[PDB]
């Protein structure tokens with residue numbers, strides 16, 4: 001029964017998930033001036049040409065676009081990673097207002113939303129055993145700013161009225177996540193956690209420097225979704241972000257500058 005409300009939001013999560021106060025929690029503020037350029041970081045390899053989306057689901061916290069992760073189709077590697085990480089799903093976090101919504105911040109700046117492309121390390125054989133490992137996941141985070149529309153996002157936007165409420169799903173095939181990327185793959189990276197319960201400390205975060213633009217209308221449609229189930233009073237799905245957590249002497253490493 002955790003959520004994003006006054007009574008069950010991020011400041012309460014520690015009572016059911018005590019690692020909320022752990023040593024490598026996410027998100028964090030990215031101090032750009034203190035991030036360390038690491039010339040030995042490799043370019044990120046995003047190989048999404050064979051991706052197979054399957055379904056979109058309103059899970060009552062966000063919506064997930066799900067992929068077939070039963071073979072190496074869409075994979076992430078390179079960058080700071082060892083080995084190969086398979087795309088399982090993506091989702092977003094967003095605000096009630098354009099001035100908020102992202103989980104990570106950049107010099108305390110908040111973006112209107114943040115996209116998370118979640119990948120699990122193939123050496124652990126599937127997702128549920130990967131989340132138990134300290135290098136189990138790689139999450140590619142991409143900031144969203146409001147401006148010109150992102151035409152690769154519109155297929156997601158348009159399906160949302162079919163998954164308005166918690167537990168609804170819809171077929172969602174042939175969606176190409178390459179259309180959600182910015183032009184540059186420059187990034188920051190650090191070791192962290194899931195940003196939702198169970199808050200497990202299993203994630204290598206890779207946060208792109210370059211945001212994508214989405215239109216006002218696109219993010220407005222995200223804000224029409226509901227946290228509640230059908231036949232319950234409406235609770236708009238907004239402000240589904242965890243605030244920045246203590247860095248606790250982790251170093252954020254930059255691939256650029």
Ligand SMILES: CCCSc1c(F)c(F)c(S(N)(=O)=O)c(F)c1F
Nearest residue numbers: 001002003007008012013014015016
């Ligand atoms: C007004 C009803 C809230 S009951 C409750 C809660 F308060 C929590 F903090 C959580 S938590 N710690 O998971 O956020 C929880 F699961 C709950 F069920």
Ligand SMILES: CCCSc1c(F)c(F)c(S(N)(=O)=O)c(F)c1F
Nearest residue numbers: 116118131139193194195196197198
């Ligand atoms: C095991 C928890 C449910 S799946 C999941 C996840 F894998 C994430 F990486 C994230 S995130 N936000 O850390 O990318 C997330 F929110 C999730 F819900």
Ligand SMILES: [Zn+2]
Nearest residue numbers: 091093116195
């Ligand atoms: Zn997320």
